[PDB]
Amino acid sequence: SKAKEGVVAAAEKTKQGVLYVGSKTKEGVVHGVATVAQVTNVGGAVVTGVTAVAQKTVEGAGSIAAATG
Amino acid sequence: SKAKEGVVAAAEKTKQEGVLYVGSKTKEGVVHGVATVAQVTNVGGAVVTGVTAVAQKTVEGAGSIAAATG
Amino acid sequence: SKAKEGVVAAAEKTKQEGVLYVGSKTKEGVVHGVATVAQVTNVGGAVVTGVTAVAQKTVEGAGSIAAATG
Amino acid sequence: SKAKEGVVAAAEKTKQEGVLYVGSKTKEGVVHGVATVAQVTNVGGAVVTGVTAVAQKTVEGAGSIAAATG
Amino acid sequence: SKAKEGVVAAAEKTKQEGVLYVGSKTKEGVVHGVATVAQVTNVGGAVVTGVTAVAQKTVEGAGSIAAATG
Amino acid sequence: SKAKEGVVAAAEKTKQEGVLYVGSKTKEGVVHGVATVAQVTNVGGAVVTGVTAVAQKTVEGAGSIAAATG
Amino acid sequence: SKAKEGVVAAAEKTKQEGVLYVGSKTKEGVVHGVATVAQVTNVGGAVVTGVTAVAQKTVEGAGSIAAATG
Amino acid sequence: SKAKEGVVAAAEKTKQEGVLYVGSKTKEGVVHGVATVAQVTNVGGAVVTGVTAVAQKTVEGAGSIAAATG
Amino acid sequence: SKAKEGVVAAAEKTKQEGVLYVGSKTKEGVVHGVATVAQVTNVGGAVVTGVTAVAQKTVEGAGSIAAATG
Amino acid sequence: SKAKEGVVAAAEKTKQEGVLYVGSKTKEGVVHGVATVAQVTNVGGAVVTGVTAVAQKTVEGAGSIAAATG
| Chain B stretch 20-59, residues whose beta carbon is closer than 8 A to a beta carbon of chain C | 45, 49, 53
CB-based contacts of C40, cutoff 8 Å, min separation 6: A39, A40, A41, A66, A68, C67, C68, C69, D39, D40, D41
The separation between the first and the last C-alpha atoms of chain H, rounded to the nearest angstrom, is 14
Instruction: Return d(Cα C5, Cα B58) in angstroms, integer.
Output: 31
Please provide residue B56's backbone torsions phi and psi, each rounded to the nearest 5 degrees: -130, 125
- Which among G15, F68, J11, G49 is positioned nearest to I44, based on CA atoms? J11
- Which among D4, A19, B31 is positioned nearest to E69, based on CA atoms? D4
CA dist G54 → A4, F43, F63, H43, I18 (Å):
70, 20, 21, 18, 17
Residue type, B49: T
Cβ atoms of A48 and A20 within 8 Å: the answer is no
DSSP label at residue A18: E
| Interface C:D, Cβ pairs < 8 A | 266
- Which among C11, A32, D43 is positioned nearest to B63, based on CA atoms? C11
Q: Could you write out the DSSP letters of every residue in F24-59? A: EE-SS-EEE-S-------EE-S-EEESSEEEEES-E
Resolution in A: 3.5
Computed on alpha carbons and rounded to an integer, the radius of gyration of chain A in Å comes to: 19
Best residue of C2, C4, C8, C32 to probe chain B, by most B CBs closer than 10 Å? C8
CA dist J69 → C19, E38, G65, H6, I6 (Å):
70, 73, 19, 13, 9
DSSP label at residue J63: B
CB-based contacts of J42, cutoff 8 Å, min separation 6: I42, I65, I67, J65, J66, J67
- Which among G58, J59, H18, F60 is positioned nearest to I57, based on CA atoms? J59
DSSP label at residue H27: S
CA dist I31 → C4, F30, G29, J19 (Å):
66, 15, 12, 28
Instruction: Return d(Cα F60, Cα C54) in angstroms, integer.
Output: 68
If you count DSSP H runs as helices and E runs as strands, how many of each does chain A have, helices first?
0, 6
Collapsing DSSP to helix, strand or coil, I2 comes out as coil
Closest residue in J to I36 (Cα–Cα): J36
Cβ atoms of F63 and H44 within 8 Å: the answer is no
Q: What value, to the nearest 5°, has the Cα angle with vertex G53 and ends G48 and G59?
A: 50
- Which among F49, I26, F59, C6 is positioned nearest to G47, based on CA atoms? F49
C-alpha neighbours within 13 Å on the C-beta side of residue E45: 10
Q: What value, to the nearest 5°, has the Cα angle with vertex B35 and ends B24 and A25?
A: 20
Strands G52-56 and C29-34: unpaired
Q: How far is CA G16 from the centre of its chain?
A: 27
Annotation: binding site of I = 32
Other C-beta atoms within 10 Å of F46: how many?
A: 22
Tell me which chains share at least 3 CB pairs under 8 Å with chain A.
B, C, D
Q: Which residues of B touch A62 (CB under 8 A)?
A: 44-45, 59, 63-64
Q: How close G16 comes to chain F (CA, Å)?
A: 5
Please provide residue J19's backbone torsions phi and psi, each rounded to the nearest 5 degrees: -120, 125
Cβ atoms of B62 and B12 within 8 Å: the answer is yes
- Which among E58, E62, E60 is positioned nearest to E12, based on CA atoms? E62
C-alpha neighbours within 13 Å on the C-beta side of residue E63: 20
Determination technique used? cryo-EM
Instruction: Return d(Cα H49, Cα G50) in angstroms, integer.
Output: 7
Which residues in chain G are followed by a discontinuity, with C-to-N distance exceeding 2.5 angstroms?
A: 16, 38
The separation between the first and the last C-alpha atoms of chain F, rounded to the nearest angstrom, is 14
Residue E61 has its nearest CB partner, among D6, D43, D61, at: D61
- Which among J22, C40, G36 is positioned nearest to I25, based on CA atoms? J22
- Which among D27, D25, D52 is positioned nearest to E27, based on CA atoms? D27
- The side-by-side arrangement of strands in the sheet containing J7-9 is F7-9, G7-9, H7-9, I7-9, J7-9
CB-based contacts of H3, cutoff 8 Å, min separation 6: G2, G3, G4, G5, I1, I2, I3, I5
Strands C63-66 and D63-66: parallel
Cβ–Cβ gap B54/A20 under 8 Å = no
- Which among F53, C62, G26, B32 is positioned nearest to A59, based on CA atoms? C62
CB-based contacts of H27, cutoff 8 Å, min separation 6: G26, G27, G28, I26, I27, I28
Q: Which residues of A touch C44 (CB under 8 A)?
A: 43-44, 62, 64
Cβ–Cβ gap C11/A54 under 8 Å = no
Cβ atoms of D11 and E12 within 8 Å: the answer is no
C-alpha neighbours within 13 Å on the C-beta side of residue E53: 16
Residue B69 has its nearest CB partner, among C11, C43, C70, at: C70
Instruction: Return d(Cα E35, Cα E38) in angstroms, integer.
Output: 10
Instruction: Return d(Cα J50, Cα A47) in angstroms, integer.
Output: 49
Q: Which residues of H touch F53 (CB under 8 A)?
A: 50
CB-based contacts of I25, cutoff 8 Å, min separation 6: H24, H25, H26, J24, J25, J26
Residue A23 has its nearest CB partner, among B4, B10, B24, at: B24
Residues across chain E: 70
Residue H33 has its nearest CB partner, among F49, F62, F64, at: F49
Residue G49 has its nearest CB partner, among I8, I33, I43, at: I33
Q: Are chains H and B in contact at 3+ CB pairs closer than 8 Å?
A: no
Q: Which residues of C touch B12 (CB under 8 A)?
A: 11
- Strand partners of residue A19: B20, C20
Closest residue in H to J45 (Cα–Cα): H45
Strands I30-32 and H30-32: parallel
Cβ atoms of D45 and E46 within 8 Å: the answer is yes
Cβ–Cβ gap H70/J43 under 8 Å = no
DSSP label at residue H70: -
Best residue of I1, I2, I5 to probe chain G, by most G CBs closer than 10 Å? I5
- Write down the H helix ranges in chain D: none
- Which among E4, E6, E5, E3 is positioned nearest to E66, based on CA atoms? E6
Q: How far is CA H2 from the centre of its chain?
A: 31
